[PDB]
Each structure stands twice: as structure tokens, then as C-alpha cells.
Amino acid sequence: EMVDNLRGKSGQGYYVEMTVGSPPQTLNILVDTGSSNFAVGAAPHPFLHRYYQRQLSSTYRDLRKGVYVPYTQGKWEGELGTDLVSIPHGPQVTVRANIAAITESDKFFIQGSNWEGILGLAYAEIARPDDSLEPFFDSLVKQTHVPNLFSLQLCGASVGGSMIIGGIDHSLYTGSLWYTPIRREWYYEVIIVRVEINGQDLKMDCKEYNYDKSIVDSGTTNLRLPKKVFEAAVKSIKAASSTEKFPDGFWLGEQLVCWQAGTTPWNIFPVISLYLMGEVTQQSFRITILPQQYLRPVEDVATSQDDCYKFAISQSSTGTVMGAVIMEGFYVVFDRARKRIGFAVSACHVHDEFRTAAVEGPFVTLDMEDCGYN
């Protein structure tokens, strides 16, 4: 019943079906671990197939307060209110929640995305206009008997996956679940203790990996890195892939790379290993990312004699973001109750006949430095 309740298009986010209001209005809502506002289109927009019509809901209540939310990509404004909300292919509950009714936006909605709103699944501390605006998942836990946990299985033109609310579906992963502590309940903030490119350590003070935070964000496409880590990573991947030479704009996300259909040279690209802080002192585990994840395919029938890709690793001035291209092929458990994040290899794991994505541990370390930036 909850398995395969997510759809999407590549680079455009993953969405679940929801209803808002009485009687219920059906909307597709992008799943975002990287924010904390539930918001839906509530006025006509060229890219919106449908929108929330507050005048048709008897349960709607205006809070008489505006809100503005700018993200890394896009922004919107609107009006706070509350209403009844359900998730048809989720738990069978109806909850009264805070809803921002988007009445104006800029570069937020995406042409042909199939979604009309966003579900911020992070904590109150980053909610706008402030932490008194109770996020949806908190409302759900408080009002129903749903356990304080959800899991995401994102799979890689159209895509799919599963959001499991209130527990863990063993059928969605193989091997062991490894847990990294949530350092601070605002974003799902975690700590990276080491980065290797094709087995070779980037040899940087580990605080750099976390300048000025590291988050797990289903609402952001790319792996985003602080400039210093980004520069060092690109150098290493360039070196590893030097059998071919790409335009500088490729590495900067300004240009596709294309190969004749079926001939993508996966093997010239390295594996990236991210080591996450363990639940025990100086211990860690690693998740390993194949180029099939960080070279994001760009579907376009005009270019379809070729397979074409964008480099899905980019530079950040606000810390590390482990985005959807990193999450895909892992089963990720947001165990809010025990303040930790679990990673396991998922049922839709990425792999060819030579290499596979993995979650492996434990790794131990002599160095007693705390890797947290602040």
C-alpha cells in the first residue's frame, strides 16, 4: 500500500499524492527533507495544472499572516492558514495542519514537473516565519498514533520510489542499516568525517567537509560541496577521468556531456565515498556513490541518438547538501524518535557488472578531532 507511492521526473523532485481541504482537493506534493514549510499553489500559474482553492474548503481557517520562503533555487510568497490534510497512499489519517497558500512565486514551480506544492519534512527551527509554525510531520505525530519516523527510497525520464511513514519496510533494502546521529534538529544535519575519490582520501581537515553544516536534503538535486571541497573533488575526478577531456563548463554544470547511445564510459569515472559519523566515538561508516548517480541523465528526444548527462555535483556557500542524486539507490531512514539517520543499500540500487553502491562499516580513526564545524 505505501510502496511505490512516489513519482517524479529526473532533476525535478519526487512527489507524493495528498489531499487538502473539505471536501478533499487532490494535489501532488514534492517531498522535501531540506525544509519545514508545507505550501501549495493557491492561485493560477502558467506551470500549474491545478491549485488549492480555499473558498471551496469548509475546514479552511486563515491565520491572517503572510509568509515568504526563499530557497537555494526559487522563492514564493503567500498566506498562512490551516486545514485538513490526508495522504491517500500513506497512513490512513486526517490531520489538521499549517498550510501556506502560495499566491506569488519566482522560479519555484517547474514546467512539466507534475507537482503543485511542497512538503517540508524537517524541524520547526527552520520554519518560516518562525519556529512557532508547527511543521506537518510534527502535527501528524501529535494528532495520530504514527511513530515518529519516516523512510525514503528514491529511485533513478520518469522516476519513482517510496515514502514509508511511521516505520521501516525491510523489503526496500538489503544488508545492514547504518546510523549517523542527527547533530542538531533543524535541518537533518549530519557529520562527514572523510571523503575519498576512488579510494584516495581528499586529505583535508574534516571540519572543512562540514563548513558550515552538512544536511540530508531530498529537495535538492545535487551533491553540493563547500568551495574548497568542491575544487579538490573536481580535481580528483578530472584526474581519474583524464582519458577524456571535457569542457570546463561541464564541470560547472553549464553544459551536458553526450555519448553515442549505450556507450557511456562509466568505467573512466571514479567512485566517491562519503564517511559519516557513527553512533560510537571515532567510528564511521561509508556510503559509496557511482558515476551513475552523480552524472544525472538529461532526457530530451532531440538529443536521443546520444545519452546525455549533467554533472550533478556543485559548489555551495552554505555547507554540504547530500541531495537526491546521493540518496537515490539508498534506503534512508529519518529516525526522528532516536535522533538518527540510517542508510542501507536499497532494492533499487545502482550497479553495473563491475561496481555497486554500498553502505559499509565500521571504520575507525585515530584522529580525535570533532568534525563539526561550529
Ligand X SMILES: CCNc1cc(C(=O)N[C@@H](Cc2ccccc2)[C@H](O)CNCc2cccc(OC)c2)cc2c1CCCS(=O)(=O)N2C
Annotated catalytic residues are: 32, 217
| CA distance linking residue 207 with residue 54, whole number of Å | 47
| CA distance linking residue 291 with residue 269, whole number of Å | 6
Per-residue binding letters, 321-340, with ligand X (x by CB under 6 A): --x-----------------
| CA distance linking residue 313 with residue 294, whole number of Å | 6
Sign (positive or negative) of CA dihedral 51, 53, 59, 64: positive
| CA distance linking residue 112 with residue 12, whole number of Å | 9
Residue 224 within binding range of ligand X, rule CB under 6 A: yes
How do beta strands 95-106 and 75-86 pair? antiparallel
Residue 73 within binding range of ligand X, rule CB under 6 A: yes
The owner of cell 518562525 is 130
| CA distance linking residue 86 with residue 84, whole number of Å | 7
Q: Which of 2, 20, 29, 30 binds ligand X (CB under 6 A)?
A: 30
What is the closest distance, in whole angstroms, from the C-beta atom of residue 224 to ligand X in the complex?
5
Residue 72 within binding range of ligand X, rule CB under 6 A: yes
Per-residue binding letters, 96-125, with ligand X (x by CB under 6 A): ------------x-----------------
Quick one: 171 or 317, whose CB is closer to ligand X?
Answer: 317
Residue 314 within binding range of ligand X, rule CB under 6 A: yes
Q: Which of 196, 217, 307, 335 binds ligand X (CB under 6 A)?
A: 217
Quick one: 133 or 347, whose CB is closer to ligand X?
Answer: 133
Question: Which run of H or of E encompasses 138?
Answer: helix 136-143
Residue 220 within binding range of ligand X, rule CB under 6 A: yes
Per-residue binding letters, 120-159, with ligand X (x by CB under 6 A): ------x---------------------------------
| CA distance linking residue 43 with residue 101, whole number of Å | 8
Residue 8 within binding range of ligand X, rule CB under 6 A: no
Residue 286 within binding range of ligand X, rule CB under 6 A: no
What is the closest distance, in whole angstroms, from the C-beta atom of residue 139 to ligand X in the complex?
18
Using the rule CB under 6 A, give the single segment among 170-178, 213-221, 264-272, 283-291 that binds ligand X. Answer: 213-221
Q: Which residue is nearest to ligand X (CB)?
A: 34
Q: Which of 34, 81, 117, 372 binds ligand X (CB under 6 A)?
A: 34
Residue 180 within binding range of ligand X, rule CB under 6 A: no
Closest CA to 37 of 190, 159, 110, 139: 139
C-alpha grid cell for residue 365? Answer: 580513526
What is the closest distance, in whole angstroms, from the C-beta atom of residue 87 to ligand X in the complex?
19
8 A C-beta contact, residue 154 and residue 161: yes
Non-local (6+) Cβ contacts of 279 within 8 A are 179, 180, 181, 340
Residue 240 within binding range of ligand X, rule CB under 6 A: no
8 A C-beta contact, residue 137 and residue 120: no
| CA distance linking residue 335 with residue 323, whole number of Å | 18
8 A C-beta contact, residue 43 and residue 54: no
What is the closest distance, in whole angstroms, from the C-beta atom of residue 354 to ligand X in the complex?
28
The site for ligand X (CB under 6 A) is made up of: 11-13, 30, 32, 34-35, 71-74, 108, 126, 217, 219-222, 224, 314, 323
